[PDB]
Design a protein around this ligand. Structure first.
Ligand SMILES: Nc1ncnc2c1ncn2[C@@H]1O[C@H](COP(=O)(O)OP(=O)(O)O)[C@@H](O)[C@H]1O
Ligand SMILES: [Mg+2]
Length: 280
């Protein structure tokens, strides 16, 4: 489908850059007619059919369709879409407190309570998405933004729907691959993928939250990928010796090779701890 083709600069003023991707750049912006602030994501379009620069129209349309469906406190929303010959421009809800990735860098490691306060929001957002048969396929700390990083209990939003897909048959087989440290073994092995791939990523994120260390990270992307397929991780005593056994149990039930045997989003919410690009 087609998007608004008026000059986006007629309607918005842009400011600081918020983030950068392979073929996307995200800039703070202000809508002229309301004075409200947004994040404008400029996605470079493919210049030819066969090209490897830019994002295919099919992929952009899929990201926009998915964004248009979502309205939940723990996920980003889509305000408007514009386009011109070079880019598609998504006007997204602004999340102004930075990435969970940078918050973690400025903290080195969280307590179980700080970890579970983030985790419960992430699980709620993922529950919403999975309820809608949307697999995110790129869950990692850089794709989890804080509304405000200077409150004791920050609120979060899941961002970056660039790899997300509807799963109509319980699995899809269209060649998806995110960041080696966070991808599930079925991604590594090029097998049919479903909602369970997100649950593995959640296990990786949880491990990092608790320890400040990445459970499968090797010295090269290929070594990480090998570690993932083999489920080559362990709870280092130096990091986890004073972490509860229930926290370890939650992680152990997510970092499971067979997606059929991995906890679902609904199981994760009822778990006792909780219940109240690939190539070098
Ligand atoms: N809605 C937003 N609010 C604030 N920052 C954002 C927002 N969306 C993206 N960013 C920043 O821009 C970076 C790149 O955007 P992203 O959607 O992750 O694109 P891609 O993975 O295609 O590069 C993010 O990691 C984040 O730092
Ligand atoms: Mg991203």
């Amino acid at each position: 489908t087609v998007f608004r083709q008026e000059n986006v600069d007629d309607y918005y003023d842009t400011g600081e850059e918020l983030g950068s991707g392979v073929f996307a750049v995200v800039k703070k912006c202000r809508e002229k007619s309301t004075g409200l602030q947004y994040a404008a994501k400029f996605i470079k379009k493919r210049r030819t059919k066969s090209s490897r620069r830019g994002v295919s129209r099919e992929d952009i349309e899929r990201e926009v369709s998915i964004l248009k469906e979502i309205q939940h406190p723990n996920v980003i929303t889509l305000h408007e879409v514009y386009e011109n010959k070079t880019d598609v421009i998504l006007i997204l809800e602004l999340v102004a407190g930075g990435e969970l990735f940078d918050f973690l860098a400025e903290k080195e490691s969280l307590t179980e309570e700080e970890a579970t306060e983030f985790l419960k929001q992430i699980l709620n957002g993922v529950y919403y998405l999975h309820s809608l048969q949307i697999a995110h396929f790129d869950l990692k700390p850089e794709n989890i933004m804080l509304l405000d990083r200077n409150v004791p209990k920050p609120r979060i939003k899941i961002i970056d729907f660039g790899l997300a897909h509807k799963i109509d048959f319980g699995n899809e087989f269209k060649n998806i691959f995110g960041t080696p440290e966070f991808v599930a073994p079925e991604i590594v092995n090029y097998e049919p993928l479903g909602l369970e791939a997100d649950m593995w990523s959640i296990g990786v994120i949880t491990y990092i939250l608790l320890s400040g260390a990445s459970p499968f990270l090797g010295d090269t992307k290929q070594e990480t990928l090998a570690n993932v397929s083999a489920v080559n991780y362990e709870f280092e005593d130096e990091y986890f010796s004073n972490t509860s056994a229930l926290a370890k149990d939650f992680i152990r039930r997510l970092l499971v090779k067979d997606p059929k045997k991995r906890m679902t989003i609904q199981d994760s919410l009822q778990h006792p701890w909780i219940k109240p690009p690939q190539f070098e």
